[PDB]
Amino acid sequence: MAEQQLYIHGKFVAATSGKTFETINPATGEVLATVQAAGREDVDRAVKSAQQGQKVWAAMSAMARSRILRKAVDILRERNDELARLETLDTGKPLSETAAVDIVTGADVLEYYAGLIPALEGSQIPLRDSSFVYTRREPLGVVAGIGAWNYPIQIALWKSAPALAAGNAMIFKPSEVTPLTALKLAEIYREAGLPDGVFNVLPGIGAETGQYLTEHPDIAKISFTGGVASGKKVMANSAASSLKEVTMELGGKSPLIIAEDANLDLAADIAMMANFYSSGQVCTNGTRVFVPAKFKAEFEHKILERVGRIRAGDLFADDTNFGPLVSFPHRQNVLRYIESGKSEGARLLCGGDVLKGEGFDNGAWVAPTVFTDCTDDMTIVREEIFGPVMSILSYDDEAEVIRRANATEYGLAAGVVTPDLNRAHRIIHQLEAGICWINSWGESPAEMPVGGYKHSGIGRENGVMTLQSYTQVKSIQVEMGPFQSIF
Amino acid sequence: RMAEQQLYIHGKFVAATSGKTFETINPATGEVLATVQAAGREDVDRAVKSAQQGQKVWAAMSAMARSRILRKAVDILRERNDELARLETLDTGKPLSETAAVDIVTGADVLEYYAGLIPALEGSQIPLRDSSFVYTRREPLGVVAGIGAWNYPIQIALWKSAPALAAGNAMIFKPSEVTPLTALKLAEIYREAGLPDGVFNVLPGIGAETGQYLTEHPDIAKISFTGGVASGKKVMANSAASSLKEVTMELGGKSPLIIAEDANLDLAADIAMMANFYSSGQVCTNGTRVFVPAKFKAEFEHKILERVGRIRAGDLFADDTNFGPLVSFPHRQNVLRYIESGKSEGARLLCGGDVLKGEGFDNGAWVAPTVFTDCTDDMTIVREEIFGPVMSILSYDDEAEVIRRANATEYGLAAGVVTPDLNRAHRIIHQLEAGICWINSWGESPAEMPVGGYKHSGIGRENGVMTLQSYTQVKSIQVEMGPFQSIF
Amino acid sequence: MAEQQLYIHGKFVAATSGKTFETINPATGEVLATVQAAGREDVDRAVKSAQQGQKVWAAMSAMARSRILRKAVDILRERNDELARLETLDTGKPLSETAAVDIVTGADVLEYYAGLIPALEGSQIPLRDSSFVYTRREPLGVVAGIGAWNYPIQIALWKSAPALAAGNAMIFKPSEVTPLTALKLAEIYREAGLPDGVFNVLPGIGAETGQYLTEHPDIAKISFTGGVASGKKVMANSAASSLKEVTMELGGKSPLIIAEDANLDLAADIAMMANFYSSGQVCTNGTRVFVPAKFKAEFEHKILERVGRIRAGDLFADDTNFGPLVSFPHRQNVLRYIESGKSEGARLLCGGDVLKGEGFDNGAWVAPTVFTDCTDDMTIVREEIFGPVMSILSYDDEAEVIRRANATEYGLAAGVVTPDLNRAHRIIHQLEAGICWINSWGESPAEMPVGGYKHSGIGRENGVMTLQSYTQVKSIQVEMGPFQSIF
Amino acid sequence: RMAEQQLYIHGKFVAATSGKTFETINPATGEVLATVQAAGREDVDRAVKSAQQGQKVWAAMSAMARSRILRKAVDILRERNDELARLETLDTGKPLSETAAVDIVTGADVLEYYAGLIPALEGSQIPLRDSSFVYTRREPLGVVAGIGAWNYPIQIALWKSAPALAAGNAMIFKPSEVTPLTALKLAEIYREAGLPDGVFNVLPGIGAETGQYLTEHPDIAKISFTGGVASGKKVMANSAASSLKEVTMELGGKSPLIIAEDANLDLAADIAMMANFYSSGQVCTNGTRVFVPAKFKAEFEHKILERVGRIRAGDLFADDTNFGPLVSFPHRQNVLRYIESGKSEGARLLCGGDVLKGEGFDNGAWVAPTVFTDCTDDMTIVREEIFGPVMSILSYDDEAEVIRRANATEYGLAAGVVTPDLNRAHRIIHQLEAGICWINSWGESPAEMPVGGYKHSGIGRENGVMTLQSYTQVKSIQVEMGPFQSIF
Ligand SMILES: Nc1ccn([C@@H]2O[C@H](COP(=O)(O)OP(=O)(O)OP(=O)(O)O)[C@@H](O)[C@H]2O)c(=O)n1
Ligand SMILES: Nc1ccn([C@@H]2O[C@H](COP(=O)(O)OP(=O)(O)OP(=O)(O)O)[C@@H](O)[C@H]2O)c(=O)n1
Ligand SMILES: Nc1ccn([C@@H]2O[C@H](COP(=O)(O)OP(=O)(O)OP(=O)(O)O)[C@@H](O)[C@H]2O)c(=O)n1
Numbered sequence A, C: 001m002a003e004q005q006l007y008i009h010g011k012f013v014a015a016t017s018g019k020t021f022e023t024i025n026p027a028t029g030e031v032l033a034t035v036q037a038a039g040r041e042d043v044d045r046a047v048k049s050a051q052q053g054q055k056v057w058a059a060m061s062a063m064a065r066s067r068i069l070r071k072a073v074d075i076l077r078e079r080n081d082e083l084a085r086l087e088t089l090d091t092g093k094p095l096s097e098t099a100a101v102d103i104v105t106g107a108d109v110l111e112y113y114a115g116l117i118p119a120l121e122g123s124q125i126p127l128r129d130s131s132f133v134y135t136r137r138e139p140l141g142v143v144a145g146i147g148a149w150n151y152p153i154q155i156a157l158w159k160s161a162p163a164l165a166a167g168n169a170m171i172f173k174p175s176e177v178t179p180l181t182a183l184k185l186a187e188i189y190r191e192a193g194l195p196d197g198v199f200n201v202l203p204g205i206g207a208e209t210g211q212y213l214t215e216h217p218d219i220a221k222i223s224f225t226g227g228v229a230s231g232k233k234v235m236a237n238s239a240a241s242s243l244k245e246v247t248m249e250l251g252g253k254s255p256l257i258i259a260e261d262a263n264l265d266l267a268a269d270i271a272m273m274a275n276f277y278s279s280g281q282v283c284t285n286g287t288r289v290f291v292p293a294k295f296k297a298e299f300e301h302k303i304l305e306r307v308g309r310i311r312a313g314d315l316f317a318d319d320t321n322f323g324p325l326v327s328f329p330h331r332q333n334v335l336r337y338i339e340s341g342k343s344e345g346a347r348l349l350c351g352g353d354v355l356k357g358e359g360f361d362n363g364a365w366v367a368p369t370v371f372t373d374c375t376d377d378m379t380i381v382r383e384e385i386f387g388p389v390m391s392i393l394s395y396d397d398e399a400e401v402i403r404r405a406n407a408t409e410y411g412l413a414a415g416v417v418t419p420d421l422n423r424a425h426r427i428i429h430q431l432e433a434g435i436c437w438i439n440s441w442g443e444s445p446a447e448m449p450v451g452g453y454k455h456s457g458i459g460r461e462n463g464v465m466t467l468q469s470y471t472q473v474k475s476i477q478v479e480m481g482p483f484q485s486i487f
Numbered sequence B, D: 001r002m003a004e005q006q007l008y009i010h011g012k013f014v015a016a017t018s019g020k021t022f023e024t025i026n027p028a029t030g031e032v033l034a035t036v037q038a039a040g041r042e043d044v045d046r047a048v049k050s051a052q053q054g055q056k057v058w059a060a061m062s063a064m065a066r067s068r069i070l071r072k073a074v075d076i077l078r079e080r081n082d083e084l085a086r087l088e089t090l091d092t093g094k095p096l097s098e099t100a101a102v103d104i105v106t107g108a109d110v111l112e113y114y115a116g117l118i119p120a121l122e123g124s125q126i127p128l129r130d131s132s133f134v135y136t137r138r139e140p141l142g143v144v145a146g147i148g149a150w151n152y153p154i155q156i157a158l159w160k161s162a163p164a165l166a167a168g169n170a171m172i173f174k175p176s177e178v179t180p181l182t183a184l185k186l187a188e189i190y191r192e193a194g195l196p197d198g199v200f201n202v203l204p205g206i207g208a209e210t211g212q213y214l215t216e217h218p219d220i221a222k223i224s225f226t227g228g229v230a231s232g233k234k235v236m237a238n239s240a241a242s243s244l245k246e247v248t249m250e251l252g253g254k255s256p257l258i259i260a261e262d263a264n265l266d267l268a269a270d271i272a273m274m275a276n277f278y279s280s281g282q283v284c285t286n287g288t289r290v291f292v293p294a295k296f297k298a299e300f301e302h303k304i305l306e307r308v309g310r311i312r313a314g315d316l317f318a319d320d321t322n323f324g325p326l327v328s329f330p331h332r333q334n335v336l337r338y339i340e341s342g343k344s345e346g347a348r349l350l351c352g353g354d355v356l357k358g359e360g361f362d363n364g365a366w367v368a369p370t371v372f373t374d375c376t377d378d379m380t381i382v383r384e385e386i387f388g389p390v391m392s393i394l395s396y397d398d399e400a401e402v403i404r405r406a407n408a409t410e411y412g413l414a415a416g417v418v419t420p421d422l423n424r425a426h427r428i429i430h431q432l433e434a435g436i437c438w439i440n441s442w443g444e445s446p447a448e449m450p451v452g453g454y455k456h457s458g459i460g461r462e463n464g465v466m467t468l469q470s471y472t473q474v475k476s477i478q479v480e481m482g483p484f485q486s487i488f
Helices: A040-059 A062-078 A080-091 A095-119 A152-165 A180-191 A206-215 A228-242 A264-280 A293-308 A328-343 A398-406 A421-430 A463-469 B041-060 B063-079 B081-092 B096-120 B153-166 B181-193 B207-216 B229-243 B265-276 B294-309 B329-344 B399-407 B422-431 B464-470 C040-059 C062-078 C080-091 C095-119 C152-165 C180-192 C206-215 C228-242 C264-273 C293-308 C328-343 C398-406 C421-430 C463-469 D041-060 D063-079 D081-092 D096-120 D153-166 D181-193 D207-216 D229-243 D265-274 D294-309 D329-344 D399-407 D422-431 D464-470
Strands: A006-008 A011-013 A020-024 A031-036 A122-128 A131-139 A142-146 A169-173 A199-201 A221-225 A245-249 A255-258 A288-292 A347-350 A369-372 A389-395 A413-417 A435-438 A471-479 B007-009 B012-014 B021-025 B032-037 B123-129 B132-140 B143-147 B170-174 B200-202 B222-226 B246-250 B256-259 B289-293 B348-351 B370-373 B390-396 B414-418 B436-439 B472-480 C006-008 C011-013 C020-024 C031-036 C122-128 C131-139 C142-146 C169-173 C199-201 C221-225 C245-249 C255-258 C288-292 C347-350 C369-372 C389-395 C413-417 C435-438 C471-479 D007-009 D012-014 D021-025 D032-037 D123-129 D132-140 D143-147 D170-174 D200-202 D222-226 D246-250 D256-259 D289-293 D348-351 D370-373 D390-396 D414-418 D436-439 D472-480
Touching: A006 A040, A006 A180, A031 A180, A040 A142, A040 A169, A040 A199, A040 A206, A062 A080, A062 A095, A062 A152, A062 A180, A062 D096, A080 A095, A080 A152, A080 A180, A095 A152, A095 A463, A095 D063, A095 D096, A122 C131, A131 C122, A142 A152, A142 A206, A152 A169, A152 A180, A152 A221, A152 A463, A169 A206, A180 A199, A206 A228, A221 A228, A228 A245, A228 B229, A255 A264, A255 A398, A264 A288, A264 A293, A264 A389, A264 A413, A288 A293, A288 A398, A293 A347, A293 A369, A293 A389, A328 A389, A389 A398, A398 A421, A413 A421, A421 A435, A421 C421, A463 A471, A463 B472, B007 B041, B007 B181, B041 B143, B041 B170, B041 B200, B041 B207, B063 B081, B063 B096, B063 B153, B063 B181, B063 C095, B081 B096, B081 B153, B081 B181, B096 B153, B096 B464, B096 C062, B096 C095, B123 D132, B132 D123, B143 B153, B143 B207, B153 B170, B153 B181, B153 B222, B153 B464, B170 B207, B181 B200, B207 B229, B222 B229, B229 B246, B256 B265, B256 B399, B265 B289, B265 B294, B265 B390, B265 B414, B289 B294, B289 B399, B294 B348, B294 B370, B294 B390, B329 B390, B390 B399, B399 B422, B414 B422, B422 B436, B422 D422, B464 B472, C006 C040, C006 C180, C031 C180, C040 C142, C040 C169, C040 C199, C040 C206, C062 C080, C062 C095, C062 C152, C062 C180, C080 C095, C080 C152, C080 C180, C095 C152, C095 C463, C142 C152, C142 C206, C152 C169, C152 C180, C152 C221, C152 C463, C169 C206, C180 C199, C206 C228, C221 C228, C228 C245, C228 D229, C255 C264, C255 C398, C264 C293, C264 C413, C288 C293, C288 C398, C293 C347, C293 C369, C293 C389, C328 C389, C389 C398, C398 C421, C413 C421, C421 C435, C463 C471, C471 D464, D007 D041, D007 D181, D032 D181, D041 D143, D041 D170, D041 D200, D041 D207, D063 D081, D063 D096, D063 D153, D063 D181, D081 D096, D081 D153, D081 D181, D096 D153, D096 D464, D143 D153, D143 D207, D153 D170, D153 D181, D153 D222, D153 D464, D170 D207, D181 D200, D207 D229, D222 D229, D229 D246, D256 D265, D256 D399, D265 D294, D265 D414, D289 D294, D289 D399, D294 D348, D294 D370, D294 D390, D329 D390, D390 D399, D399 D422, D414 D422, D422 D436, D464 D472
Parallel strands: A142 A169, A142 A221, A169 A199, A221 A245, A255 A288, A255 A413, A288 A389, A369 A389, A413 A435, A435 B472, A471 B436, B143 B170, B143 B222, B170 B200, B222 B246, B256 B289, B256 B414, B289 B390, B370 B390, B414 B436, C142 C169, C142 C221, C169 C199, C221 C245, C255 C288, C255 C413, C288 C389, C369 C389, C413 C435, C435 D472, C471 D436, D143 D170, D143 D222, D170 D200, D222 D246, D256 D289, D256 D414, D289 D390, D370 D390, D414 D436
Antiparallel strands: A006 A011, A006 A199, A020 A031, A122 A131, A122 C122, A131 A471, A347 A369, B007 B012, B007 B200, B021 B032, B123 B132, B123 D123, B132 B472, B348 B370, C006 C011, C006 C199, C020 C031, C122 C131, C131 C471, C347 C369, D007 D012, D007 D200, D021 D032, D123 D132, D132 D472, D348 D370
16 A cells, blocks of 8 residues: 555645554555654644634534535445455454444444434523523534544544534544554545544554644543553543543453353353454453353353354455454463463363464464453453453352452443343343443444443443533523622 | 541541641631641541442432432521531631622532432433333442532532432542631531431541542542642542543633623623622632723723722621632732732733731731733733732723634633623624623522533533533443344 | 312412302211312402412522422421321222322422422524524413312322422312312412412312313413313313313223233232222223233132232221222212123122121222123223222233233223243333333332323323423524515 | 326325315416315225334334435435425415425425434433332324425425424325325325335315314324414314324414514514515414504604515516415405405505406415504404414504513414514513514524414424424333232
8 A cells, every 4th residue: 555644634644743654464464554643743733724624514504514424424335345345454353344343333323423413402591580591512622532443443433423413623543553444534524525624534653643632732622442551641641731521432341241040052142242253352342251150061061162163264255253363462462361361270261372374374363262260360350351362250149240240440341141120130230330231242322322430431432422522511691680799 | 716627437527547637727817727637548548438338328219318318408508507607707718798698508509409300310211123222320420529629618518519419429528728617517417417427528638648549549430629720630630540530620710701892881890890809809710801892991990990999808707898818828929929920011000919908907818909901911910810809901902803812711611791782792602612601790600500611621510410410420221132143 | 077168379268159069978978078169250260360379489489489399398298197087088098098108199299390490491502603592491371280089189299299390370170079188288388388379279060160270261281180081071172262281191991911921929919909909999000900821710819819808997997908989979880880791791700799787888888899701892891990890811922912902092001020021121112001010010200201192191290201391382593693584 | 287186195196085076276377286186084094004004114113214214305305396396386376486495495404303313212211219210212102193284385294294204103194275286295205215105195185074084083193283273273172072182283373573672673674574474474473463662663664665665476486576476265365354354443554455456466366465554452453363464563662561462362373572682682582472482583493493382372392302202102111120019
C-alpha cells in the first residue's frame, strides 16, 4: 500500500511530524502499509478544522443530520465485503467474522443514532406563574475518540455515531496496530455529505498522538477503549490538562456461571462463544467459567470435544473460524500468561502452544487453550489475558459463586446459564457487572447500553443514554417578575 | 469555645486513629470555635467498611421506606433552620441574614426534592424479538465520597448527599478544614431521622491527607468535588489513577453578565450587585464580568456607586447586616493581590479596594466591596476568578462582539443577560458557553434545575432528575429464550 | 349515624335535590345511614367551587402541593383503623382486609404521587437557531371521578391522588352502595390543608348524579371504575355532551394459567387468592383457572382443602377472612350465575348456596363456590360474576391455553404459575391483558400502571404515566426569525 | 377522466361488495374526477381480517426492519411529491403553490420522524424489593382505524398512519368522501416500500356507512378522527357504545390571534393573513378571531385591506396563484350563510362577502376573501367555526380583558400572540386555553411538536414522541421470585 496520510477537513493531508509507523499483517508478518503519525501541530490543525465543521453541522436541522448519517449507513452496507477484507488483513480476524459482525454491527449503531437525532429534547420546568426554566442539550463541540485494535471500524462507528448524532465533531485516533479501516470510514462519511472537519482521522502512537489529543485545551471530551492500565493514564492526562468529560471502555475478567440445573451442552456452547470468538481478543469475554463440582468432569469433556472442532486456517476461507492474534508482541504476552498458568499448577486441558506447520509458522497463532482446576488467586484467573485462554473453576453453592464472581476489580460483563426463572434473575441481580447475559453471550444491540463497573470503565456506549451523554445540559431561567436585590 | 469535634462513623462520634487535629476559627473574631480531629488513612478505611455495611441495609429497603427517612431529615432541618444557620455563620463568617434564609432552606429543598423522586427511579425494557428482550437496572454505585467547599458548607453537604442517598448509595463526606461544623450536625440529623448506621459518615480533615485518602481508596466508586478549578484537576487525576472512579466536579467561574442596550439600568445594577457581593463575593456562579453598552457605561457606574454605598458590614447576627468578612486572612490576602493587580494594570478603581479597619473589623478578614471599571479582556482581574467582592465593568459596542468576549474564556459555569426583548434574550443566551443561564435575574438554583459548568468549570451536574440517575450505574440484562447457537 | 350531606368547598352542605337514599349494612340488613343525593344544581355548585379552588391549588409551588398531600397521607396512616371499621360496615369486607389493604394501599398511591409532583416536566425542542418549541403539562382543570363499591376509599385515593397531584380539582361521586368513606376523605384533605373546592364529594345515584357529572360542560375529564356495561353508558354520555377525556377501569374475566411444571400447592394458593379475596368482588380476579388435564384431580383436591379453611363470621373478628356480598341485590345476581353453571352442566365442587344459621341469615352471604369440568361456552366462564365463583378448566397444550385465555372481550389481568424462565416470559408476552402476574396474584404497586385491554378499560391508573395523563400538553413555538407571508 | 377507483385491501385494489359508488368533484370546474367504490359492512369485515393478519407479520419484524420500510416510503413520497401534489390540488381545490410545498412535504416529514423513533420505543423496569420486580411492554393495540378530513387529505393520512404503523399496528384508513384519491395512492406507495399486505388498507366511503362500520367494529382497538366538532362527538359516542375503543380526535377551533400594544402592525397583519386565508381559510388551527388594541384598530384594518388586495385567485396550477376555491359547493353554501349572518347581526364588512364571478370562477366553488370588523363576542361569526376565508377583527382595551375573551369559548385548538416583549409573550401564552400556541408566527407544525385541542377541540394529540407511545398499550408484568403467601 501507499504511505497512508492523515484525514483532516474532508481530504487526505500529509503529516508535518516527519514520523511514520508500520502495520503488519498478523497472518504473514508482511508490512501492510507505512502510516503517517500526527504531530502536535497536526492535532491543532485537526481541532481547528473540527471547530469549523461542527458549527456548520450543528446549524443544520436535526433531520438533515439524520439523512447524512443514513447515507453513510447505506454506503457501509454496500462496501461491507470490501471493508471486511481490509479489516481481516489488518487484524487477523477471520473473514467469517469481519464480514458478518464488524461493519454490520458498527453500521447498526450509526443507523440507530441517525434515527434518534430528532428525539433529542430538553425539558421545561415551571417554578411559579412569573418564572420558568427550560434546558437545552447542546453539543459538547469537538470530542476525541481513541480506538482499540480488536474491533477497529466497529469501535470507530460506536464512538463517532453518537458523537455526530449529538451535533459534535469527532477527531478519531485509531490504534497504531490497526489504523486502516478508520481512514476509509472518514472517506465514507465525506461521501455521505458529512461537512468537512466533522470527522477527522489522525493515526499515530498513544505516547505522542493520543497524548496530544488528551492534552488539547479545546477538546471537550475523550472517549477511550483499551486496556485498564492505558485507560487510567488517559483519564489522568485528560484531567490535568483541560478537565475533559470522559468515557472509558476497558477490559474485564467476566464470569460465566453455570448453574446446577443447566444443560451442559448449552453451557459448553456458551463458554466456547464467550472465550474463542475473535481468537479471545474481546473485552467482554467470559474467561472465568464457574462449573459445579458435580458437573466439572463432564463439562471438561464437552469443552475438549468442541475445541477440537475449531478450524484455524486461511482467514479468507469460508470454514475458518479462528485467527492469529493481532500482532506478534501480543502473542508473546499471551504466551507469558499461559506459562504463568503452568507454573502455578493450573491443569492444561488443551492447547497452550503456538500453531506450527504450513500456513501457521509465519502468523501470530496461539492454540485455543483451556486451563482447569483453577483457583481464585492464580494470575491467569485474576488478570485479563486478551487471548484464547479459558479458565475453568469448580464451585459448590450459589452464595459462594456469587462472592467469587464479584471478587475482582473488573466489572465489565457476566452471565448465567440456568432454565430456572427465579435463579436467573436472582443471580444476575447480585453480580457487579454492567453487561449481563442469561443463557447466551456476546449480543450487544444498538439499543442496549454497555460499559463497565469498577475498574472496567467510566460511562456507557450505545442506547439512548449515550446520545445524551454526548451533549451538555444548559439550564435557562426566565424571570418575568421584578428582581429583588437586598442591597 | 465548643466541645472537641470527632469523626462520625457508623452512627456515632468516634475518635480519630490518626492522632492529628486542627482548629476551626470564627472568621469575624479570630477565636477558636473548636478543635477538630482529622481522619487518617485507617479512619478512611474504617469509614469505607462502615459505609459498605450500611449501604447494603439501605439499598435493601423499599423505595418509599428510603423516601420517608429522608423526609424526616427534611423536617428536622426545617425545625432547626435558625440554629444551624447561626452555627454556619460562626464557622464561615457569612451574615445570618443570608444563612437563615438560603443555606439550610435550599439544602433541605434539594433533600426534600430527591426524597420524593426515589420511587420514580426506573430502568428500561427493550424488546429485541419474540424470543429475547433486554431490561436495565439503575443500581447504586455503592460507596461514594463527597468533598465539600467552605463557602456553603451544609448546602453542599446536602446537595451531594441527597441524590447519593436517594439513589441507594452510602456517602462519606469530607467537609472543608475551614468549615467542618455543620456537616457533623447533619450526620446526627440523618441518624435521628432513621438513616441506617454507616450510610452517611463524616470525616473532617485537611485536603492534603484526608481528601487524598478518599480519592485513592480502591472501594469508593465515585468522587463528587466542589472547590477551585486548580484543586479540581488534582482531585480528578488521583481519582482516575487510583481506581478509575466516576467523577463530578463543581468548580469556579468567571461568569459574564450581559446588559443589553434596551435594559433598564436600575434592574441591571440590582442584578449586578446581587451577582457580585452576596456572601462577600465568595460564590462560584458570580457574574464578575459585567458587560455594559458604551453609551450607558457612565450612568451604570453611577448606579453601582449608589448601591455599593448601601452595603452594610457589621455584626453578623444583626438583621440589617448584609456583608461579611472573607473566610480567612489567607483568602483575603489573595483577594488583595488581585485588587493590587487591577490597579497596576490600569483599570480604574470605582470604589473600595482596601481592608476594613476599626472596632469590630480588626479581628476579621474584611475587604471593602470593590468595583473596577475601564477593564479590558487581557487584565488579570478579568481573566481569573478572584472569589472575593471585586466586580469588573467592561464596555462593549455590539451584540456579536459581546457574545465573543463573554465566551472567550476557559471558564464556563454561569452567564446572564438583562433585556426586556423576547428575541434578544433567547438569542443571546443560546450562544453563551455556560451551564447555568439567568435571564433578568441572578443566583436562583431550583432543586429541579441541573447546574454545573462547561469547559474548565466542571464535570457533570448537580440537582434535577439527571443527578439522581447519575448516582446510579446501568446494568443491561439480556434474556435469551431462544436456542443459543455456537459457531464452533 | 347522622344523615350524610354533600361536601362542597370545604364544608358539609345540604343537597338542593330534595332527594335521599339509604346505604345498607350487608352483614345485618340494617340501614347504616341516610345520604343526601346531589342534583343537577348541586353538581353545578360543585363545579364552580372546584374552578375556584383549582386556581388557588395550581398557583401554589409544586413542593407546596407535595407537602399538603403528604400531610393527608400522615392523617390516613393515623386513622387507618377508624376508616377501616367504617369501610367494613359499608362494604361487608372483613376488618382483616380493610385495616391491612384498603386504606394502606390507598395512602401508598397518594404518597407516591405527592413525591412526583416536582418531577412533572414539559419538554424543549430546538428547530433551528432562530426558533424553538417548549411544552407545558397544564392541569385539565376540573375533573370528575366515579367510584365503585368494592374498594370505596382506595378508589377515591387512586383517582384523586394523581388528579390533585397534577394540579386539578376533582369532584368525586362514590358508589351509592358505599358512600361513607369518601366523605371522611374530604374532611381529611381539608384538614391536611387542601384548598376549599379542590376535592368535593357528591353522593348520589348513578342514573342521576353520575349522569349530571358526565354531562357538565366545564368538566374536562371523567374517570370511572365499575362494570363493563355501566362503563359504556358513561363513556358515550361524556362524548354526546362535551368531548371529555376519559379513563375507564372496568371488569374482567382474567385467566390464571397453571403450567405443567407448576407446584400445585403454590398454584392452589394463587388460585385461592385470585378468587375469594373481598368475597370475590375484585375486578382483577383470576376467575378462569386453567389447569393441565394430568393435574386436574390433584388441583381440585388442593382447592377443596383450602376452601375448607375459609372463615366466615363476625367481620370484626381477627380470624375472619370472608365476608358477605356488598348488597342483597348483588347477591341475587351472583346466585343467578351460580344456577346457570349448574344448569349448563358444570360440576359443582363446593358451595353454590347462601350461608345459613345464626349470624348469617340476616347477611348477604354466598358460600365460596367452585365449578370444574367447565367449557368455554358456559355463561359462568364467559361473563364476569363479581362474586366468589371459581371456574376450573382443563387444557392439554401451551398453544391451546393461550388461545383460550385470549378468546374473550375482557382484557384486564392474567397470570401464569411456572418455575421455568422461558415459559413464564414467553406465555406472558402473548396474553392480551394489561396486568400480568408471574407466580403471584393481586399485588398492585403504586409504581405499576394498571388497566384493561379491549373491553376492560380505557387508559391506566398508577405509575408515572397516570400523573401525566391528568395533565394536557400545550406546545409553544417561539419564532425569533422574520415571519414570511405569501400574501 | 380517471379509472374507477377501487378499495385497497391486503396489498391490492379490490372491488367493493356494497354495490354502491360515489363521485368526487374537481372544485375548480364542477367536473367529475372519478367514480369511487364505497366500502360496505362486509368489505370492512374483510379489511379487518386482512389487517389482523398483516399486523402479526409487521410486529414480528425487528424494529429496524420496520424503520427501513417506512423510510423507503418516505423516499418514494419525496420523489413523487409533485405528482401527488397535483392530484391533491385537483381533488381539494388547493393551489399547487400550497400542495407541492406543504401537503406531502410535511406528511412525509412526520413519517420520516416516526420511522427513526421505532428503535427508541421502550418499556420500563421497576424494582420492588430484592425478590420481585416489574417490567412493562409497550405492545401494539392491534388494528386501528383512521378517519380523515378533506382539507389536508394525504397529510392527515400520513400523520395518522405513521405513528400507528411505527408502533407496530395495522391501520385501516377511511378518507373523506370529498377527497378519496391521494389516500389510495399512499396505499400503493406503502406496498412498493415493502409494507406487508394488510398493514395499511384504504376504504373510501361515506361517514354514515363506512365510517360508522369502522367505529362500530368489535376488533378495531382505536379510532383516530379528524373533522368537525359535531361529527367528532358522534364518532366518539359510537366508538364507546360499540366496544370501548381508544380515541383520538382532532377537531376544529375558533382560535384567537392576540396583537399586543407593542406589536409591529405589518408583522401582525402578515400573521393575521397567514392565519386566515391559507387553503382558502379551510384550516382547523386558523386564527379567525383577531384581537387588536383599540388604538391600533383603524391602522390594522388598513394594512389588512392592502394585503387582501394582493391575494391572487386563478389557475390553481399557476405559480403565482395563492388562493383557491372552497372544497365543494355545499361547503360554500355553509360559508355564505355565515357571511350573511355577519351582515345581519351588524358586523362591518370591510371586504369580500360574496362569491367570485366571471370566466374561470362561475364553475368553481369560490368565495372572496372576507374581513369583518367591529365584531362582538356574541356574534355567530365570532362564536362558531366557519371553515372559510372569513376573518373577524375585534377591538380590546387591556391584557386581562383580551385573555378572558380569548378563553371564553368551548373551542380550544390554537392561539397566538404578536409582541416583541419577553414577559408579555410568555405571560399571555401561559394563560391561554389552547393546545397549540404560536409566538410571532402562525401555522408551523413540526413533527416533533405534539398538536391537539383543549376542551371541545379534541381528545389526545398527534405528532411528537408521545403520539408514538399513545399508539401502544402498556402491559405491566410482575415477576415474584419470593414465596407467595395466601391468607387462606
Ligand atoms: N471556586 C473556588 C475558588 C476558590 N476556592 C477557595 O479559595 C482558595 C484559593 O483560590 P484559588 O487559588 O482560585 O483556587 P484553586 O484554583 O483551587 O487553586 P489553589 O490550588 O492554588 O488553591 C482555594 O484553595 C479554595 O479554598 C473555592 O473553594 N472555590
Ligand atoms: N367490575 C365490576 C363489575 C360489577 N360491578 C358492580 O356490579 C354491578 C352489576 O354488575 P355487572 O352486570 O357486571 O355490571 P355492568 O356490566 O356495568 O352492568 P349493569 O348495567 O347491569 O350495571 C355494576 O353496576 C357495579 O355496581 C363493579 O362495581 N365492578
Ligand atoms: N374543522 C372542521 C370543520 C368542518 N369540516 C367539514 O365541514 C363540514 C361542515 O362543517 P361544520 O358544520 O363546522 O362541521 P361539524 O361541526 O362536524 O358539523 P356537521 O355535523 O353539521 O357537519 C363537516 O361535516 C366536515 O366535512 C372539517 O372537516 N373540519
